[PDB]
Amino acid sequence: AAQTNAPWGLARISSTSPGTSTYYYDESAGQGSCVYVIDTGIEASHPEFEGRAQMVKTYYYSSRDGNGHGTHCAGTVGSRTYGVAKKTQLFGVKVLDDNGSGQYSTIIAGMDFVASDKNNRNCPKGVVASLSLGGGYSSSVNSAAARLQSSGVMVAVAAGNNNADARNYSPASEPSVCTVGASDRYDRRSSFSNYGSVLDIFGPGTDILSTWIGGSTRSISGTSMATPHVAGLAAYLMTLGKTTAASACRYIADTANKGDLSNIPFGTVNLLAYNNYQA
Ligand SMILES: [Ca+2]
C-alpha cells in the first residue's frame, strides 16, 4: 500500500533517504495488535480513529482528553491519515491531567493496570504500550516500566526534551524498555532531544502533524511525537510476524537506517526507525 502526500515522519520511516512524501506499508497495517496510549486520554470519537479507539481507564474525574497531547500521540500510532499502524486497536489510559501533569504514583498505577488489563483483551498479534511522558529519575518509575515489559508488552518511552543525557530521567533511563529520541525532517537530531547511551532508537519528532481534540489536527514537536512512531512500527511488525514484544526494540534497532543522522553525540546510537517495506 502507498499513502501519497503523507506527513513527513510516516514517509521517513518507509524510506532510506529524507525528503520523500509517500508512506509505503503492508496492507495488514497492524490489524490484530493492540496499543495502549498512557497519556492525557484519547478523543475516541475523532473520525480519524474509525471506531478503533476506546478509553479503558482514567485516574481523574473524567476519561475525556481535555488537553490534546494523548489524542495527538494516539493519532501517530493508529489514525487513518496520520498513523503508522492504520488498523491497530487503541486503548487509552488517562494518567495525566488536562494540564499534562501527573504524580509518579498515578503513572505507576497506570503501568501496572495495563499489565493486568491486557489479559482481558483479544490482541492475537501482541500488545504495545506508548509512554510519551517522563520526569526526573525515580527507581520506582523505572521498576514499573520494567515490570510492564516483563509481563509481555512492548514498552516504548520518550527520551525527554532537555537536550541532556537521558540517564537522569524516568522512565527513559530504564534499560529494558525502548527509549526513543527525536529527529527532524533534514535528518538532524531534534534540537531539544535528549541523548546518551540509554537511547535505543530515533524517530521523527519535529513538526509532526496528527489528530487533536475537537475533531481537529495540529503539528507539534517533542520526543513525545517520536515515541508513537516507534510504538506503531512495533505493532506493525508484530502483526507481520517479524518479531515479538520481547525482542521488538532490538529488531527495530537491527533493521534501522544506520549512520544517517547528524548532530549525534559520541556514545549515542545513530539509528533511525525503518519499516524495510518492499513491494
Ligand atoms: Ca533499552
UniProtKB/Swiss-Prot annotation:
**GO terms for MF:** metal ion binding; serine-type endopeptidase activity
The cofactor(s) it depends on are: Ca(2+)
* Domain Peptidase S8 intervals: 7-279
What is the enzyme's main class?
hydrolase
**Which residue positions are annotated as catalytic?**
39 (charge relay system), 69 (charge relay system), 224 (charge relay system)
Where, by residue number, does Ca(2+) 2 bind?
Answer: 16, 260
One GO cellular component term of this record is: extracellular region
Give the cofactor note: Binds 2 calcium ions per subunit.
Q: Which GO terms describe its biological process?
A: proteolysis
- List the EC numbers from the record: 3.4.21.64
Is the keyword Nucleus in the record?
A: no
What does the record give as the reaction this protein catalyses? Hydrolysis of keratin, and of other proteins with subtilisin-like specificity. Hydrolyzes peptide amides
Name the keywords, alphabetized. Calcium, Disulfide bond, Hydrolase, Metal-binding, Protease, Serine protease, Signal, Zymogen
Highest taxon of source: Eukaryota
Q: Where, in this chain's numbering, is Ca(2+) 1 bound? A: 175, 177, 200
Q: Which cysteines are joined by disulfide bonds?
A: 34-123, 178-249
The answer to whether the entry has keyword Protease is yes
What is known about what this protein does?
Answer: Hydrolyzes keratin at aromatic and hydrophobic residues.
Family recorded in the similarity comment? Belongs to the peptidase S8 family.
Its protein name is Proteinase K
- Organism listed in the record: Parengyodontium album (Tritirachium album)
Q: Which residues of the full protein are shown?
A: 106 to 384 of 384
